[PDB]
């Protein structure tokens, strides 16, 4: 997250850190949202690599013991059948991870609230992106969870020539684009929390940013629109 602020320890309990085994240790690669005690929602591009993944819930500082973490292996990965690694702009950048064990819920580990199917946010709706992603374009991961206020940019505007053009689809949510705040590498797969009817719900799964940089004016961060996949999500969980 570029241009973010450090999140409070218990502000985003559904946020998870998806890590892969690197040598004798683990490395954070993406974010995700805990949606069931044994299911995590993340981006499909996060799991394209044939790596060994683990999920960490109740995480705050990637480099120090917080006394609230729970580590669990990923038992099964279900990527959306229409996902094409060579075409992120086509959409379907979503995957569900079934955890080897069901995590324990508490103040630091909670299920993310998903929006009602088909829900579309009005332009400039209040949302926060959270993650441990790069704090600057071509920079380094944050040590502590970051959050950045990123108001949505509706489809009409986001798909205009000045913005993303045909690159963005209606199956996506755009947010930010002010040139200062944005998601960045390492935030992928994480949540876009938007306040609706007094309750924050996860409306987006961080998908992509501009090849020119993370915080680029008129190139808002693009997320997979969760409300477009409610049936798919329910179908996967019910069948696994």
């Amino acid at each position: 997250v570029v241009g973010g602020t450090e999140a409070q320890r218990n502000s985003w309990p559904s946020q998870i850190s998806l890590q892969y085994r690197s040598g004798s240790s683990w490395a954070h690669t993406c974010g995700g949202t805990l949606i069931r005690q044994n299911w995590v929602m993340t981006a499909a591009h996060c799991v394209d690599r044939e790596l060994t993944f683990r999920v960490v819930v109740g995480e705050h500082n990637l480099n120090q013991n917080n006394g609230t973490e729970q580590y669990v292996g990923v038992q099964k990965i279900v990527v959306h059948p229409y996902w094409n690694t060579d075409d992120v702009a086509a959409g379907y950048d979503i995957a569900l991870l079934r955890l080897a064990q069901s995590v324990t819920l508490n103040s630091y580990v909670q299920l993310g609230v998903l929006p009602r199917a088909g829900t579309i946010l009005a332009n400039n709706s209040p949302c926060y992106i959270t993650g441990w992603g790069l704090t600057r374009t071509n920079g380094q991961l944050a040590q502590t969870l970051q959050q950045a206020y990123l108001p949505t940019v509706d489809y009409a505007i986001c798909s205009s020539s000045s913005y993303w053009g045909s690159t963005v689809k209606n199956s996506m949510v755009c947010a930010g684009g002010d040139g200062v705040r944005s998601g960045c590498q390492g935030d992928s797969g994480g949540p876009l929390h938007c306040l609706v009817n007094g309750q924050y719900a996860v409306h987006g799964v961080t998908s992509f940013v501009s090849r020119l940089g993370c915080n680029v004016t008129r190139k808002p961060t693009v997320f997979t629109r969760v409300s477009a996949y409610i049936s798919w999500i329910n179908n996967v969980i019910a069948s696994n």
Binding site: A89, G183, S207, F208
Partner: peptide, 4 residues
């Protein structure tokens, strides 16, 4: 496009 840049998957992040």
């Amino acid at each position: 496009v840049e998957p992040x």
